[PDB]
């Protein structure tokens, strides 16, 4: 049983290994990274890959009022046999627009740093709003 | 880092604490619980609540060719401060129809057993197919 | 000529032999089991089998504001000679969605109780609204 | 529980009170009144009214290879209280065309005989074929 | 040169020999026998036989706002030599639906009265609308 | 009660007033004016206008093995009041192609002779074949 | 008079001072940076600021098959008197989607490098296609 | 780097080579050539051709309060190889109406003087207002 | 030519056959039945039916200062031929409010007495005031 | 009780004393004097004066398919005492346009013949369509 | 605490002492007495007087789908001392139109029966819709 | 038949169970709670809920010269079936301003005491003044 990442009061509370990626997202998202009381959480973007540590850093980075990433999880085995683990992180955003900027934000970071892994991603829509208000 | 639940060859491999719920789903889903090679994984249903053990049993129950549940995870903290953990499980299904039957299947089980928790749930649609094929 | 089953003010008015199945449906259907003044009755689901008693219990069970079952009836003889009787019950619902939940509700009950008969069923659509308002 | 009307080898087996209406339908339907092995029973027309005797005569009249009427039944009570009974008869036909001719056939009979009751009616379509072959 | 049958203000203006058949059609057609200003006259049904008197009565009967029969005419000789005359009447209707009801209406009358002739008939479609508007 | 126009063994049997128009059609139609035993009579073209004499000449002109015109008739009154008579002639042809050539043939004649009336016309299709064989 | 920037056969032909920004755009734009023969050039994005050198580097960076930047230009004086020069660069793209990614691409670069100037920008639509084909 | 053309305090400050074209535009545009403080600069028209000198004269001509032309610039090379330069001038106007009059104004001048080049042109719309206020 | 009904000084001057209906209207209308010098006569309500005697009684009943009915008249023939007479009475009222109360007053009387005819009615508005003052 | 004026088959059926005024209206109204099946009778124009004979001639004149005048009637007495009779005629037209042409048509006739009385008139609008179809 | 009057399935369920007044309202209100699902309950009419029994009969009478009367209540004491009770009944209607017909309906009944009390009344409008829907 | 609440000479006459709520309103309303001889009673606010006892206390509390609450009553059943009783209290105030303060006064009390029920409420306007003077 895993636990959710810790929210930030200041940049320093964000783990030192994730700060570079966190600050980049803070500036890129800008106003879209802030919270909208009027909007509900019916959207998210799911990144997945084979490196859990990289996805860990991503999960710790995407931590804002309007953009909250879940802990490092994983998808179930694709076949009947046990297979190499495909880890994943759900980055919950406010609206469909923000989701596109978030998955773009990571794409921008991937372009800025070729050492970073090329993570697959998909936009996610929930029929009912998730309890992520206030 | 968490690991995906183990697939079943037979009913017995399913943990004893989850078998009752597993067998019920096997019969209820029926043909919809089987896998379709032609279809892709652009759908899922997310159950969430405060009891991780109950959600654990659910995750272990929903394990079929066309219906695979992820491990017990959790949603991120809603506010700036750390808060009581809202655990969740993503049950990935094949098509939009199956998703409705899955979230109904649990609803049927909840009706069959009043001791079971009334889990919140939502249908999920992914823009891009998840790597859950052979 | 056959008379329609009696409506319920409380659970107890429902025949003791049907109460278990009735309560299960009450909880499963939930809000969909309630009546919608705006909607008309252009839908129903017809269960059929060889056991009239089982179908009787079903008819007595499906008795709500938005879901009303007709009395136990039967389909006509298939050939020129008299043949084993195929009994049937028309469960009239409000909309096409409810009909799918109703035929699912029974399917859930059949899964909950293997002693119960595996009833065949079909969704029914009427071109003109039936007089089942108020 | 109600038993299905008896099929006819000859006109005389049809109850004397229904023969006039039966012969009229025999001639009117003509070839459409015959059975089609290739076609399935996914169609029917439901007549309803307050006179069970009239509907009884109708049920006994519509008895052919391609057109079989069910026994006199009734719709469920509209409100919470018991109410005047609205009786009904399901006349199962082969295809959507025949159904229109059947509900027209009765309409023709109603026009031929003003003493006959003006029965309400609706075309019915079943998603799954009813067991009415052979 | 022939002249078109006279329209009716009341049932009595219809020739006494045709009233029985006229009233029957009035009731059978019902609302479909009324005229639709929005619709055009691209449809008709042609009855043909060897009895001109019977066809005369038919022509006088089918006289409504939405259903107008032409005068008694005839088809041309089939071969090079003069042959027994095949008389015909064009009953012009509003839409393709009405045409089917009209040729059915006569079929109903033929079934009601075995003394009446079994007239052949065919649905007719015109590419361009006939001048049968106000 | 009218009678059908007389067939021709030779050009002279055709009324002297119609020969000019008849010969023109003979040459224009050509092989299409001949009879096809394989084909049925499910087609025709209806000319209509206010001059019965002109339409008479047309009816007498269009007299061939594959193209037979009916006698001069008329359409029913358009409104509730009696109105100027709109006469018409049905020229029955073999196939949909011939019908287009026939209504063109007249259009050619109208162009050849400005004294001739500009007759309205429409292609006609019958669902069942008319008895015009041999 | 001014001349358009030189196209690239390889990354090295791009001026050394612009390569960092050029490579970043190459990876970020990805497939959208490629040329579409089917599409026309009715779109562009105009960056403007006070630093011509920075805009020069931008103009040299945005040089691809589907994305071509014009030379460093400037907007006219806003008032009647001569004023500080507002330089600008038109980055011509293929479609409205690409334009949004281009102005985002620069926004990503601005976020990656705080030393870079915060350039204003606007999406541009041309009624008629510009001559920027092969 | 390029610099924006100089504004006019009087007609004489406009270069002698451009005065003829300038005066013509002054009179033609009339009131539309004046500035509107209420309106923003979200519009322009872009002339392009191969003669930079002609476009230079155009740029110097279109210099008013409500109509300001940019300096002579050029479009980027269309293909991978260097190509004949297509020069262009952006004439920024106040509203969509003025833009149509401006591109018409030049068309009028082209008609007045056949020696002048037939410049291509396109209406331009900016999503965000350009800094061209007082 | 028809003469207008006689005004009343007292209830008795009103014809004995109309007094019951007159007194009812007197009480129902109340203050609205009185005359308003300030208001003009741009309103009325027209009752029509087939019984002239009933309409006569109505005309004699509606006789007040603010509500004056015209004599029994009739609408013109609908068709070219003489037809059953549709009689009518214009009840002229003061304002649009009164008109609604008048046509309601009759509706109240029709409800009070089922023997009375169900008269059709319509509110009437005149562009110019009728000479009904003093 | 007053009977509606007689419709015309020809000009001569119109009373000799009214023919001059009738023919004038026939030509003036023109196409607007014809009937429109699509339109309803929610309009009319009411002429009123002291000469019943003149109004009689008017009533007999305005007799067409789209324009039908009622018989000579009168307005109720204005005061409590019997007063000189103000006669009136309701000329029912099809639409608001026709009404203006009708009251103009009379105005034209009044201008053509100074011997004719200067009749007052008003446009009339009915909320509900009068039974004047066919 | 008081309880709301009982709804009616049939006229007989309405208390015998109120049936006369109930039937009268049924006929008078007519279609306006029926319920409109689209409309909300922001309207009502309050009758008040000193006779509670009469108001009781009124409350029992006004019981329809679109018109529901509350139980017999009363207004508070006007002064500081206890005073003769002014009883009242709130008759809740659907729209502002119906309210005027309801208070008129009673006024009609009061006119029909002079023995009935002359109840004071007022139209009532609620800012927010009352919970009187299904 | 209910009776109106008793007025107060002093705080003690107010039932002990209601004094806390009464005193609070006395202070809050202040001068608005006093009577205005000039103003009439065309206003009120209606509180409704499921707890009659709570509404009883409210009715006893709102008892002043300018603010008088009626006794505990109830709304009629919303549907055709008998339903849980929705009790209500009409608090009659002097003007539209006071009504807003009264419904606010209760809202203030509800905020002061979370044990108190959250009562729904609506502003009420009467067309005619209620007899609540002196």
PDB file of C-alpha atoms in Angstrom, chain I residues 21-126:
ATOM      1  CA  UNK I  21     -77.576  33.621 -18.651  1.00  0.00           C
ATOM      2  CA  UNK I  22     -77.702  37.414 -18.317  1.00  0.00           C
ATOM      3  CA  UNK I  23     -77.815  37.492 -14.514  1.00  0.00           C
ATOM      4  CA  UNK I  24     -74.956  34.989 -14.344  1.00  0.00           C
ATOM      5  CA  UNK I  25     -72.791  37.263 -16.496  1.00  0.00           C
ATOM      6  CA  UNK I  26     -73.782  40.346 -14.495  1.00  0.00           C
ATOM      7  CA  UNK I  27     -72.433  38.775 -11.305  1.00  0.00           C
ATOM      8  CA  UNK I  28     -69.401  37.102 -12.880  1.00  0.00           C
ATOM      9  CA  UNK I  29     -68.088  40.093 -14.832  1.00  0.00           C
ATOM     10  CA  UNK I  30     -68.845  42.394 -11.908  1.00  0.00           C
ATOM     11  CA  UNK I  31     -66.882  45.639 -12.110  1.00  0.00           C
ATOM     12  CA  UNK I  32     -65.351  44.579 -15.438  1.00  0.00           C
ATOM     13  CA  UNK I  33     -68.874  44.595 -16.875  1.00  0.00           C
ATOM     14  CA  UNK I  34     -69.144  48.327 -16.241  1.00  0.00           C
ATOM     15  CA  UNK I  35     -68.132  50.973 -18.778  1.00  0.00           C
ATOM     16  CA  UNK I  36     -64.844  52.866 -18.825  1.00  0.00           C
ATOM     17  CA  UNK I  37     -65.048  56.310 -20.487  1.00  0.00           C
ATOM     18  CA  UNK I  38     -61.246  56.494 -20.675  1.00  0.00           C
ATOM     19  CA  UNK I  39     -60.940  53.253 -22.654  1.00  0.00           C
ATOM     20  CA  UNK I  40     -61.810  52.701 -26.317  1.00  0.00           C
ATOM     21  CA  UNK I  41     -63.424  49.776 -28.132  1.00  0.00           C
ATOM     22  CA  UNK I  42     -60.525  48.075 -29.900  1.00  0.00           C
ATOM     23  CA  UNK I  43     -61.485  44.639 -28.609  1.00  0.00           C
ATOM     24  CA  UNK I  44     -64.164  41.974 -28.939  1.00  0.00           C
ATOM     25  CA  UNK I  45     -64.717  38.225 -28.777  1.00  0.00           C
ATOM     26  CA  UNK I  46     -66.484  36.275 -31.509  1.00  0.00           C
ATOM     27  CA  UNK I  47     -68.484  33.176 -30.625  1.00  0.00           C
ATOM     28  CA  UNK I  48     -69.524  30.885 -33.473  1.00  0.00           C
ATOM     29  CA  UNK I  49     -71.531  27.675 -33.848  1.00  0.00           C
ATOM     30  CA  UNK I  50     -74.385  26.038 -35.749  1.00  0.00           C
ATOM     31  CA  UNK I  51     -77.227  26.888 -33.364  1.00  0.00           C
ATOM     32  CA  UNK I  52     -78.547  30.415 -34.035  1.00  0.00           C
ATOM     33  CA  UNK I  53     -81.057  30.280 -31.169  1.00  0.00           C
ATOM     34  CA  UNK I  54     -78.348  29.560 -28.605  1.00  0.00           C
ATOM     35  CA  UNK I  55     -76.232  32.348 -30.051  1.00  0.00           C
ATOM     36  CA  UNK I  56     -79.321  34.564 -29.955  1.00  0.00           C
ATOM     37  CA  UNK I  57     -79.632  33.968 -26.219  1.00  0.00           C
ATOM     38  CA  UNK I  58     -75.923  34.731 -25.841  1.00  0.00           C
ATOM     39  CA  UNK I  59     -76.272  37.982 -27.790  1.00  0.00           C
ATOM     40  CA  UNK I  60     -79.183  39.051 -25.603  1.00  0.00           C
ATOM     41  CA  UNK I  61     -77.278  38.076 -22.451  1.00  0.00           C
ATOM     42  CA  UNK I  62     -74.047  39.994 -23.094  1.00  0.00           C
ATOM     43  CA  UNK I  63     -75.572  43.472 -22.869  1.00  0.00           C
ATOM     44  CA  UNK I  64     -73.787  45.850 -20.503  1.00  0.00           C
ATOM     45  CA  UNK I  65     -72.060  49.236 -20.487  1.00  0.00           C
ATOM     46  CA  UNK I  66     -68.608  47.757 -21.006  1.00  0.00           C
ATOM     47  CA  UNK I  67     -69.753  44.635 -22.845  1.00  0.00           C
ATOM     48  CA  UNK I  68     -72.077  44.820 -25.847  1.00  0.00           C
ATOM     49  CA  UNK I  69     -72.865  41.893 -28.136  1.00  0.00           C
ATOM     50  CA  UNK I  70     -73.879  42.382 -31.761  1.00  0.00           C
ATOM     51  CA  UNK I  71     -76.910  40.715 -33.329  1.00  0.00           C
ATOM     52  CA  UNK I  72     -76.799  37.122 -34.556  1.00  0.00           C
ATOM     53  CA  UNK I  73     -74.798  37.082 -37.789  1.00  0.00           C
ATOM     54  CA  UNK I  74     -72.885  34.439 -39.732  1.00  0.00           C
ATOM     55  CA  UNK I  75     -69.568  33.705 -41.424  1.00  0.00           C
ATOM     56  CA  UNK I  76     -69.389  33.513 -45.220  1.00  0.00           C
ATOM     57  CA  UNK I  77     -69.561  30.200 -47.076  1.00  0.00           C
ATOM     58  CA  UNK I  78     -66.178  28.427 -47.040  1.00  0.00           C
ATOM     59  CA  UNK I  79     -66.385  26.903 -50.523  1.00  0.00           C
ATOM     60  CA  UNK I  80     -67.821  27.843 -53.941  1.00  0.00           C
ATOM     61  CA  UNK I  81     -71.122  26.153 -53.087  1.00  0.00           C
ATOM     62  CA  UNK I  82     -73.646  27.152 -50.436  1.00  0.00           C
ATOM     63  CA  UNK I  83     -72.975  25.274 -47.197  1.00  0.00           C
ATOM     64  CA  UNK I  84     -74.471  24.712 -43.738  1.00  0.00           C
ATOM     65  CA  UNK I  85     -74.499  28.112 -42.039  1.00  0.00           C
ATOM     66  CA  UNK I  86     -71.943  28.887 -39.345  1.00  0.00           C
ATOM     67  CA  UNK I  87     -73.600  31.580 -37.243  1.00  0.00           C
ATOM     68  CA  UNK I  88     -71.592  33.978 -35.101  1.00  0.00           C
ATOM     69  CA  UNK I  89     -71.925  36.783 -32.571  1.00  0.00           C
ATOM     70  CA  UNK I  90     -69.423  39.566 -31.954  1.00  0.00           C
ATOM     71  CA  UNK I  91     -69.277  40.497 -28.277  1.00  0.00           C
ATOM     72  CA  UNK I  92     -67.522  43.859 -28.177  1.00  0.00           C
ATOM     73  CA  UNK I  93     -65.620  44.559 -24.968  1.00  0.00           C
ATOM     74  CA  UNK I  94     -63.546  47.464 -23.670  1.00  0.00           C
ATOM     75  CA  UNK I  95     -60.042  46.042 -23.207  1.00  0.00           C
ATOM     76  CA  UNK I  96     -58.020  42.869 -23.815  1.00  0.00           C
ATOM     77  CA  UNK I  97     -58.514  41.817 -20.191  1.00  0.00           C
ATOM     78  CA  UNK I  98     -62.304  42.029 -20.351  1.00  0.00           C
ATOM     79  CA  UNK I  99     -62.332  40.003 -23.571  1.00  0.00           C
ATOM     80  CA  UNK I 100     -60.585  37.143 -21.770  1.00  0.00           C
ATOM     81  CA  UNK I 101     -63.117  37.328 -18.934  1.00  0.00           C
ATOM     82  CA  UNK I 102     -66.037  37.408 -21.365  1.00  0.00           C
ATOM     83  CA  UNK I 103     -64.950  34.326 -23.306  1.00  0.00           C
ATOM     84  CA  UNK I 104     -64.290  32.808 -19.882  1.00  0.00           C
ATOM     85  CA  UNK I 105     -67.704  33.903 -18.624  1.00  0.00           C
ATOM     86  CA  UNK I 106     -69.354  31.899 -21.393  1.00  0.00           C
ATOM     87  CA  UNK I 107     -66.980  29.027 -20.678  1.00  0.00           C
ATOM     88  CA  UNK I 108     -68.132  29.181 -17.062  1.00  0.00           C
ATOM     89  CA  UNK I 109     -71.769  29.108 -18.167  1.00  0.00           C
ATOM     90  CA  UNK I 110     -71.044  26.165 -20.478  1.00  0.00           C
ATOM     91  CA  UNK I 111     -69.542  24.366 -17.480  1.00  0.00           C
ATOM     92  CA  UNK I 112     -72.538  25.262 -15.313  1.00  0.00           C
ATOM     93  CA  UNK I 113     -74.982  23.962 -17.918  1.00  0.00           C
ATOM     94  CA  UNK I 114     -74.036  20.887 -19.993  1.00  0.00           C
ATOM     95  CA  UNK I 115     -77.200  21.369 -22.048  1.00  0.00           C
ATOM     96  CA  UNK I 116     -75.670  24.557 -23.435  1.00  0.00           C
ATOM     97  CA  UNK I 117     -73.655  24.278 -26.642  1.00  0.00           C
ATOM     98  CA  UNK I 118     -69.862  24.257 -26.612  1.00  0.00           C
ATOM     99  CA  UNK I 119     -69.304  27.417 -28.646  1.00  0.00           C
ATOM    100  CA  UNK I 120     -66.011  28.092 -30.385  1.00  0.00           C
ATOM    101  CA  UNK I 121     -64.545  31.539 -29.743  1.00  0.00           C
ATOM    102  CA  UNK I 122     -61.670  33.877 -30.541  1.00  0.00           C
ATOM    103  CA  UNK I 123     -60.267  37.105 -29.120  1.00  0.00           C
ATOM    104  CA  UNK I 124     -60.507  40.006 -31.559  1.00  0.00           C
ATOM    105  CA  UNK I 125     -58.371  43.136 -31.798  1.00  0.00           C
ATOM    106  CA  UNK I 126     -59.211  46.152 -33.955  1.00  0.00           C
TER     107      UNK I 126
END
